[PDB]
PDB file of C-alpha atoms in Angstrom:
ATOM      1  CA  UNK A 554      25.467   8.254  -9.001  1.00  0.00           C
ATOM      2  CA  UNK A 555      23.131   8.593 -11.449  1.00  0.00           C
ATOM      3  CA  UNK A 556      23.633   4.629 -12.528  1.00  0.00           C
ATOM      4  CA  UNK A 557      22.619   3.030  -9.201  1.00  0.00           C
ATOM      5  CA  UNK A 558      19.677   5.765  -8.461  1.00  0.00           C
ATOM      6  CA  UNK A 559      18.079   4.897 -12.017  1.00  0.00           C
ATOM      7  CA  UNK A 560      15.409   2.903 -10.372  1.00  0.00           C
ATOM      8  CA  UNK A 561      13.752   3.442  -7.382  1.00  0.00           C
ATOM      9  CA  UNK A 562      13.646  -0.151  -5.981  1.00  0.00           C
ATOM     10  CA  UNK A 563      15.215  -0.099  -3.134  1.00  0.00           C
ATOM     11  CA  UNK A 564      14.864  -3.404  -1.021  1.00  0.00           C
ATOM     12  CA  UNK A 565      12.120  -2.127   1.490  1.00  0.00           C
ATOM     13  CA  UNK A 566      10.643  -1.075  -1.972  1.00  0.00           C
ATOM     14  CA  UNK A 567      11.096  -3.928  -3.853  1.00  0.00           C
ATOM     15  CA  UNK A 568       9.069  -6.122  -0.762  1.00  0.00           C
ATOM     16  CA  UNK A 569       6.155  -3.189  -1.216  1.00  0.00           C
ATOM     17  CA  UNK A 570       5.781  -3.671  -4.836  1.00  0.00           C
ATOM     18  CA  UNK A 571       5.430  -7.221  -4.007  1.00  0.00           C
ATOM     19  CA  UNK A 572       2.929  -7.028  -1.411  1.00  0.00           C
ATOM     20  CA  UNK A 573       0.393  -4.917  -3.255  1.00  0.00           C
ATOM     21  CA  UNK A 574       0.773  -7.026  -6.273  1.00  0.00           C
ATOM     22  CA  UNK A 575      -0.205 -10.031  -3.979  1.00  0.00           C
ATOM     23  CA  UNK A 576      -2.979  -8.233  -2.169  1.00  0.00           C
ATOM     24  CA  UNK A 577      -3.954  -6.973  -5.698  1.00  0.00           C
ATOM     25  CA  UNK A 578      -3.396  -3.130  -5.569  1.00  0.00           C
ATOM     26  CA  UNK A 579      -1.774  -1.040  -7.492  1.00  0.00           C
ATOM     27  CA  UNK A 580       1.514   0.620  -6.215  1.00  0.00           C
ATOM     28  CA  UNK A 581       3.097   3.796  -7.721  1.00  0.00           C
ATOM     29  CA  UNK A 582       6.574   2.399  -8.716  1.00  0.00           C
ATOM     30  CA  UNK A 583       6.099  -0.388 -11.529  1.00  0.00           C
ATOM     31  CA  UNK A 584       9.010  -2.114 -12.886  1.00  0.00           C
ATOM     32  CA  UNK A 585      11.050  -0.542 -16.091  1.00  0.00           C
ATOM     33  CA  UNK A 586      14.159  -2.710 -17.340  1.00  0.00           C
ATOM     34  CA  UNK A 587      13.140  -6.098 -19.497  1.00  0.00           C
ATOM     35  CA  UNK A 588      14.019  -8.631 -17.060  1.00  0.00           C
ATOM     36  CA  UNK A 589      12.718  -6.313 -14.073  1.00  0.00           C
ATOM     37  CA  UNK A 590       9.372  -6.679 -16.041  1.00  0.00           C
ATOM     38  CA  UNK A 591       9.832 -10.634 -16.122  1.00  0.00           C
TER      39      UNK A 591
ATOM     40  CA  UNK B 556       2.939  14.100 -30.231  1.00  0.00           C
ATOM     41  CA  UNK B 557       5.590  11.316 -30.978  1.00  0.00           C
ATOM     42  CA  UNK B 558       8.007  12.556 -28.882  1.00  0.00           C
ATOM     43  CA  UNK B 559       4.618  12.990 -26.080  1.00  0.00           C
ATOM     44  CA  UNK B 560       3.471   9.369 -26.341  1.00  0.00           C
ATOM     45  CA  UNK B 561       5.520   6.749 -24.010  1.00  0.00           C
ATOM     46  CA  UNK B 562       4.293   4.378 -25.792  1.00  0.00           C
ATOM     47  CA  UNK B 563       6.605   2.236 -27.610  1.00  0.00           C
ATOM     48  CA  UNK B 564       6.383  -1.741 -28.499  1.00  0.00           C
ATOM     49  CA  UNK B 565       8.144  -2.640 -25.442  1.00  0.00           C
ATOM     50  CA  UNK B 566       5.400  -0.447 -22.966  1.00  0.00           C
ATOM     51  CA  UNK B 567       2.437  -1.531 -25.153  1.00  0.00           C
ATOM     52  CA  UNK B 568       3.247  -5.131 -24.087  1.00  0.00           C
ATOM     53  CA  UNK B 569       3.341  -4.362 -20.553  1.00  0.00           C
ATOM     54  CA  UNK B 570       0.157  -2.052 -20.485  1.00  0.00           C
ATOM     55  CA  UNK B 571      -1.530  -5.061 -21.956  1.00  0.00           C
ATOM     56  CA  UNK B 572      -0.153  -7.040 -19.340  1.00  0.00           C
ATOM     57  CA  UNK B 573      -0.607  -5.209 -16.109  1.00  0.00           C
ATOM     58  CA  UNK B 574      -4.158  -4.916 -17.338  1.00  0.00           C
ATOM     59  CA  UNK B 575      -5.153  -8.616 -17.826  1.00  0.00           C
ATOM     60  CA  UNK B 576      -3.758  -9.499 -14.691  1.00  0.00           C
ATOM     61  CA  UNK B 577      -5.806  -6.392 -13.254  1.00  0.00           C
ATOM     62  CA  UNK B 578      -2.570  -5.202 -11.385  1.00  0.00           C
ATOM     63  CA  UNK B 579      -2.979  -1.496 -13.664  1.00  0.00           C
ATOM     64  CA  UNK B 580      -0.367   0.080 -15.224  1.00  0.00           C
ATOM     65  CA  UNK B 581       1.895   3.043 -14.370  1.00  0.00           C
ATOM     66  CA  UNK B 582       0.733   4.725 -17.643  1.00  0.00           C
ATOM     67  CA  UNK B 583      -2.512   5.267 -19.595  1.00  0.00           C
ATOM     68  CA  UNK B 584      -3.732   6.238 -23.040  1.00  0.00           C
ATOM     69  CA  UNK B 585      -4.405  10.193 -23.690  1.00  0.00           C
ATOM     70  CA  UNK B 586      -5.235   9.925 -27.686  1.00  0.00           C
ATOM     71  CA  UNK B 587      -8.948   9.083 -28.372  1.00  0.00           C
ATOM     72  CA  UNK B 588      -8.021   6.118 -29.892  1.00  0.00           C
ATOM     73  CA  UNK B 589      -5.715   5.039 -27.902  1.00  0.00           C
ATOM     74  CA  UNK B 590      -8.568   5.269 -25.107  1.00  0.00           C
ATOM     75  CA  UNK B 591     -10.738   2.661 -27.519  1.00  0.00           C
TER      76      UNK B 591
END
């Protein structure tokens, strides 16, 4: 499905983006949709 | 090119974002200008 694979955070992914943003690094995947930026 | 650049409004707000907060963004400038 090419609806439900647009973005790549998953929830093991979605807890990664979140730690390097608190342990101030920069991850690859960064947030695309509006009120995934918020 | 236009079609080259991915920046629109709507990324120009969040490269300006990611780097105040020092987090760095997923993309990066490639004109000269858009370097400055």
């Amino acid at each position: 499905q090419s609806s439900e694979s647009t973005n790549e955070f998953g929830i093991f992914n979605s807890l990664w983006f979140s730690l390097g943003a608190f342990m101030q690094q920069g991850c690859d995947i960064s947030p695309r949709s509006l009120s995934g930026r918020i």
